[PDB]
Design a protein around this ligand. Sequence first.
Ligand SMILES: [Mg+2]
Ligand SMILES: [Mg+2]
Lengths: 390, 378, 226, 221
Amino acid sequence: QNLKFAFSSIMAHKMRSLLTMIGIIIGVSSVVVIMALGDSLSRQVNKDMTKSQKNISVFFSPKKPPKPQESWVQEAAKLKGVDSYYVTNSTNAILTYQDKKVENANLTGGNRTYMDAVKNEIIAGRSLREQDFKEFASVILLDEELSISLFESPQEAINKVVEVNGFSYRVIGVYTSPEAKRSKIYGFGGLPITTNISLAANFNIDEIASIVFRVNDTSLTPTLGPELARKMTELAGLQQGEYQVADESVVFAEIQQSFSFMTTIISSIAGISLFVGGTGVMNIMLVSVTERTREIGLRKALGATRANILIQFLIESMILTLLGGLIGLTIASGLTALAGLLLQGLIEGIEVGVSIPVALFSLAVSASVGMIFGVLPANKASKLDPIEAL
Amino acid sequence: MQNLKFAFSSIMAHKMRSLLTMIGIIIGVSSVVVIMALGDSLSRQVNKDMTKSQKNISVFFPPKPQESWVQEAAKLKGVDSYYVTNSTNAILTYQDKKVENANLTGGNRTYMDAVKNEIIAGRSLREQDFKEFASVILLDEELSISLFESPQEAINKVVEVNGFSYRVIGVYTSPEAKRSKIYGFGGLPITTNISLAANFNIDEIASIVFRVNDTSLTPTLGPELARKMTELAGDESVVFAEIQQSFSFMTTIISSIAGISLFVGGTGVMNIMLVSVTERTREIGLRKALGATRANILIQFLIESMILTLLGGLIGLTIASGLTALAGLLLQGLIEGIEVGVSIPVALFSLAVSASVGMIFGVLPANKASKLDPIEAL
Amino acid sequence: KQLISLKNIFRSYRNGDQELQVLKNINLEVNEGEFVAIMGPSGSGKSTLMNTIGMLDTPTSGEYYLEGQEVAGLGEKQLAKVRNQQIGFVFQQFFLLSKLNALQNVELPLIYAGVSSSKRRKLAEEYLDKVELTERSHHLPSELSGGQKQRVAIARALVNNPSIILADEPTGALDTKTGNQIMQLLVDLNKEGKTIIMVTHEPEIAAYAKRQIVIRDGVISSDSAQ
Amino acid sequence: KQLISLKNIFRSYELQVLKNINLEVNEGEFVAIMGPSGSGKSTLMNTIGMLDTPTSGEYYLEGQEVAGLGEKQLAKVRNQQIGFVFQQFFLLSKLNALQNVELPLIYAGVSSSKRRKLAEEYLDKVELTERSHHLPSELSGGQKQRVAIARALVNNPSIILADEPTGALDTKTGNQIMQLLVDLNKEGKTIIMVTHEPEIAAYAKRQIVIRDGVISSDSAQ
Ligand SMILES: [Mg+2]
Ligand SMILES: [Mg+2]
């Protein structure tokens, strides 16, 4: 049959076929390796996407800027199904200590419920206490790897003065979480936390910006969300604006498909190699037509049909590019796994690039390549006249 | 050089095969030279901006300095003009919208025409902004649009520069601003240095710049200015070749990924040259019976794979100049004011490579060709 | 008994403006067990006649009745079936596929016939026995001599028990001594009742066949039937 | 004068092909070598053509000792002195008649302009008119071997080595090509040819027969 003739021919010129495959190996493994990382990076964001669905962000929409009282938010949070609440400031900070520096850390402004609500685990020293709010204290917590970068050790970091934005802060604790460990990808040098009333007093900013409610049963959010917003406006007084639910996904997806774009640009450049590989497999297939012009003619004298020859030379190029984009898919999957068992000094997050969608897409492409670049030759061969060939 | 005629006869023997073999190298050299050339333009552009950083002598030595001395020292024969500035990188809000870590310059009276900030909307700093202790601000064009959609839109409205209310009295632009994008500057707002010292408790004067527009004068003059500005109260370019280093690194990493397609293109020729050798074993024996040596056949089949890649490289280079020109036009939005193109070193680097690709890959079949026995061939 | 039956056969080879005529009113019939030999100068189109009969060429006008049924006009897919079952091609240079051994080079027509692998090797063996091959069947044509390669080529021509063997100058790539060995084989095969129609430019070789035909300018110009 | 002088030529591979070969051949001769299969029929020829070096013994070509010379040297000697003719013609497919004939002259160091003159003179010597620029695609077998024979003559060799010249040709056209060789032998070129057919050997002056690595007959005695 036509599959066996395909395999016989490939085995006939082993080192020619082998060399051709290597062009497809190289190209597929390059594309899959690049596509792996960009996916794994993407999926480690889509974890955070779904952690954020437990949160309900409320904000002041001017149309259906008054000072928001904190005890409104506590009262709203009474609402059944709401497990906790918190309010925060934010700002940038350049964070100098002694001769060290991290010039883009995101300084967060908690409100006594914040630390507990977001479940941050204290590893050295203490969390924010009630005294720190009533004394207007410039106290600071650092995340595990900010403390390591700035003070060699979370233990060593405790009770050191760190200049924040030319403002002296005393380090009370070091914390860590899942989110802090993996938050280098969002482009942050650190996630230090202090009281919102310190942020609000040192830097000019007012003391509430984001208002959040945690609702651990996520199926309630379509109803509880707008209810918490309504309840906010019933308590805030009709100041002619109305509180609304902030959509979480429109800022996550704004960074999700910026990683995707830039994966595609580098994945394309790697793809140029697979495309060159493709022109290579077409070309060698064409030499195997002229190499076998007499053979085809003889085959047709013996009873080969145009159709037989056409699918034989198709199958022959497909066997090259599939077996190629599989040896390649594997060697990619390898390098990707050892690229992950390496990115551990940066990220605490699953990066193996197994992704069934990219694996299957590699084979899908690998097929198309053989099919596309293999028809012109297979056509040429099928059309060859027995009389002219003999 | 009959080997060159032999090479071209063979190339021309299978035109559409030699063509498809060349297309690997074109596709390879094109994409490599395009990445290498943009990365080279980004580096060369940065390198032009360093030769602006030598027409600006900066003297640094704190104690509280005073503009009276800088004004005095600026009468010296080479010194074209002077200015003095005030710094902070604070954050510009405007009702939910928010630009991060813009470089807020606080200039003196002379700062506007010494640096030459061309205003596109409204007005620049007038003197009654210094005298009356006003909190007013100029925004750069790309900071203007990012914060307020249009340029004219931003005008006469309130910004929150680190909290303090600043009235946008104008919006400016220059080449040096349009490229501030590449140095990671969020924006370049200018203001009155009186109102930077008031609103942030920084010193009124912090940088002292002496504009000298004779390049072949900054030695001898510049050291004198530093030791005149020391008579009252009893040096070189910064980390400019650091972005130069960082770009060059990113150029490499990407250009190498493009370079794989040249490596596959190279295994392309080796595969085609290997069939060439088997499929004219009979010729090789014939030629050797006519008096071709082992060495003749060797340097014939090598010259053929070199010509084949070298041509592809030379074509690929050309096609990577058209490509690296409309790339110039594409980057009149993003970066702009840039001279983008393929430098003479980059151009012949590619020729050296493409030549070398042909050799490395092509010696292996050229060897097999050379050691062919005439008897078994015939 | 009646196999080949050409009739009013023309073949005109169009080539831009040149409607160049080759075969013209070829009338001819051939019966089973015959050994015809076709002779003539270059340009006469013994080639074109032969392919016409072997179903590699379709005639411009006229008729060709293989075993009574008309076969000039059948679709390629169906015509290629008829060719596989009815025509055994023997060539001057032997046209052995160099990556296949003698055994599987002889098996090849059985694949297109659609024969099981069990049978194919044994059908091949039996027919390599029929042509008298001493050098082992598991050798490439690389390591075979002339007469041995032409034996394999004739075994391959016989494997699907065809009606006609078309031979085109079989001795043409062979020395007198081993050519006469192959010519006896063809005589012995035709003696067993297998029809043969052979082209040659050699009076010495046409002499082995039961019937002489000559073509001049695409016209059968002398038979031995009368 | 004397051109070929083989003396005590052994060739072995463990198989022994040639065994005390002693043959002399003078200018103008036309020697036809016949013999049974694997007598060293071709190994002798490739020894005379310098494509094979003997395991022992000596070969003087136009008086020059050539057995055991270097590869670079033995190619030049081959080029100047030998004119191989082949059964199958062995013309390069992409070069036309003139260019095919010009090729041995390229491996000598001759002017590109002068090659053209010499090639045309030798296409004339072999009666090949107005097919100067035909590819082998476009030539008959007689025409092809005519071109191939012109290629053997262009460098004024001492020896024309011919290996069954009319094997690919029909009996009519062989006789024509065989007459061509005879005429070239008449003008004074030495031909050592090999053949399986007595009808072809007939044309030669002398008649050698090799059996198992050693000459058995010789019509010159
Ligand atoms: Mg004919
Ligand atoms: Mg022999």
